[PDB]
Amino acid sequence: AMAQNITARIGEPLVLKCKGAPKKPPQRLEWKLNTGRTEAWKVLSPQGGGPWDSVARVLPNGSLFLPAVGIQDEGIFRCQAMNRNGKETKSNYRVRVYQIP
């Protein structure tokens, strides 16, 4: 149980790198985040996109960029992976916007 303290501004673009994929070819990957209501949690795939794809995309280097991080983006983000044996990456980042409700 942990989390990194990161300050952000509402409507301001933010970029972060979420490594994890070993040296082997592009393996599976799953996106998960814990929040009060949770409305950003989306399923990321190496071949396909969803709704969150329009809200935020992943760079070829395994990064993450958001056009404008708002209150909905608040909360804590977490990365995870799925290998043949079931290997997952543990990491939680705490993100908060300037003006809050």
Swiss-Prot record:
Classify the source by domain of life: Eukaryota
Q: Kindly list any coiled-coil regions of this protein.
A: none
- Spell out the molecular function terms from Gene Ontology: advanced glycation end-product receptor activity; amyloid-beta binding; DNA binding; histone binding; identical protein binding; laminin receptor activity; molecular adaptor activity; protein-containing complex binding
Question: GO annotations under biological process?
Answer: astrocyte activation; cell surface receptor signaling pathway; cellular response to amyloid-beta; glucose mediated signaling pathway; induction of positive chemotaxis; inflammatory response; learning or memory; microglial cell activation
Task: Identify the glycosylated residues.
Answer: N5, N61
Which Cys-Cys disulphide bridges does the record give? C18-C79
| Up-regulation conditions | Induced in T cells by antigen stimulation and by the S100B ligand. Induced in trophoblasts by DNA damage.
Which subcellular locations apply to this protein?
Cell membrane; Cell projection, Phagocytic cup; Early endosome; Nucleus
PTM summary from the entry reads: Phosphorylated on its cytoplasmic domain by PKCzeta/PRKCZ upon ligand binding. Phosphorylated by ATM following DNA damage. Targeted by the ubiquitin E3 ligase subunit FBXO10 to mediate its ubiquitination and degradation.
Q: Sorted alphabetically, which keywords does the UniProt record give?
A: Cell membrane, Cell projection, Disulfide bond, DNA damage, DNA repair, DNA replication, DNA-binding, Endosome, Glycoprotein, Immunoglobulin domain, Inflammatory response, Membrane, Nucleus, Phagocytosis, Phosphoprotein, Receptor, Repeat, RNA-binding, Secreted, Signal, Transmembrane, Transmembrane helix, Ubl conjugation
Mainly resides where?
membrane
Known tissue expression: Endothelial cells. Increased expression in pre-term labor and preeclampsia placentas compared to controls.
Q: Please report the stretch or stretches of sequence annotated as the Ig-like V-type domain.
A: 3-96
Task: Answer whether the UniProt record assigns the keyword Calcium to this protein.
Answer: no
| Cellular component GO terms, alphabetical | apical plasma membrane; cell junction; cell surface; early endosome; extracellular region; fibrillar center; nucleus; phagocytic cup
Subunit-structure text: Constitutive homodimer; disulfide-linked. Forms homooligomers. Interacts with S100A1 and APP. Interacts with S100B, S100A12 and S100A14. Interacts with TIRAP. Interacts with HMGB1. Interacts with LGP2; this interaction plays an important role in AGER-mediated pro-inflammatory responses and cytokine release. Interacts with double-strand break repair protein MRE11 which is a core component of the MRN complex. The interaction enhances MRE11 endonuclease activity and promotes DNA repair.
Q: Function of this protein? A: Cell surface pattern recognition receptor that senses endogenous stress signals with a broad ligand repertoire including advanced glycation end products, S100 proteins, high-mobility group box 1 protein/HMGB1, amyloid beta/APP oligomers, nucleic acids, histones, phospholipids and glycosaminoglycans. Advanced glycosylation end products are nonenzymatically glycosylated proteins which accumulate in vascular tissue in aging and at an accelerated rate in diabetes.
Q: What is this protein called?
A: Advanced glycosylation end product-specific receptor
- The gene that this protein is the product of is AGER
